[PDB]
Design a protein around this ligand. Structure first.
Ligand SMILES: CC(=O)N[C@H]1[C@@H](O[C@H]2[C@@H](O)[C@@H](CO)O[C@H](O)[C@@H]2O[C@@H]2O[C@@H](C)[C@@H](O)[C@@H](O)[C@@H]2O)O[C@H](CO)[C@H](O)[C@@H]1O
Length: 163
């Protein structure tokens, strides 16, 4: 089988730059979040297949918020990437990953957070947000793995085909 660095237990830590954090939730709902503490608070949530347009509650940056979500796929899971731009602001939707594999991944590099988006088996690191803070903490509700940038091809393989 594939050999990855992990699984690590859910935690909050200063994710080092140039590593994919491949997150592997077992449950729907909040999966992970992070912030530069100044102008980006980002979060991903997992939605099961066959979910009509609805409002669900998530606890993001410690606060209970209602967010509009949907997943019209009969078979694919969906990660949704939400971001708020100021401490007291509301989250907007920026990207999604529709997947048969239930894995998502992000990396801190070049002052950005890169994120795998699209639909498996053709998801790719096509989305990013700007954080300009290499010491931005991430918190995770799921087990996760770390993959060096030199193995981006493997991260892409895992996102799209599973471990
Ligand atoms: C939420 C956030 O932090 N956005 C950054 C980010 O914005 C980029 C980025 O999301 C890429 C990902 O593929 O898509 C765009 O390029 C986006 O830029 C924004 O949209 C485009 C079309 C332009 O109008 C651009 O001016 C705009 O910023 O990176 C940029 C810098 O490259 C900003 O830092 C955003 O705030």
């Amino acid at each position: 089988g594939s050999t990855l660095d992990g699984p690590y237990q859910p935690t909050t830590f200063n994710l080092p730059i140039d590593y994919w954090m491949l997150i592997a939730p077992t449950q729907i709902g909040r999966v992970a979040e992070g912030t530069n503490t100044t102008d980006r608070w980002f979060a991903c949530v997992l939605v099961e297949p066959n979910v009509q347009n609805t409002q669900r509650e998530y606890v993001l940056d410690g606060q209970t918020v209602q967010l509009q979500v949907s997943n019209n796929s009969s078979t694919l899971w969906k990660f949704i990437l939400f971001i708020k731009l100021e401490k007291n602001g509301a989250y907007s939707q920026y990207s999604t990953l529709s997947t048969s594999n239930k894995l998502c991944a992000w990396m801190k590099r070049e002052g950005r957070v890169y994120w795998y988006a699209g639909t498996t088996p053709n998801a790719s690191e096509s989305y990013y947000l700007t954080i300009n803070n290499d010491n931005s903490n991430v918190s995770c509700d799921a087990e996760f793995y770390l993959i060096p940038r030199s193995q981006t091809e493997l991260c892409t393989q895992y996102i799209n085909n599973g471990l």
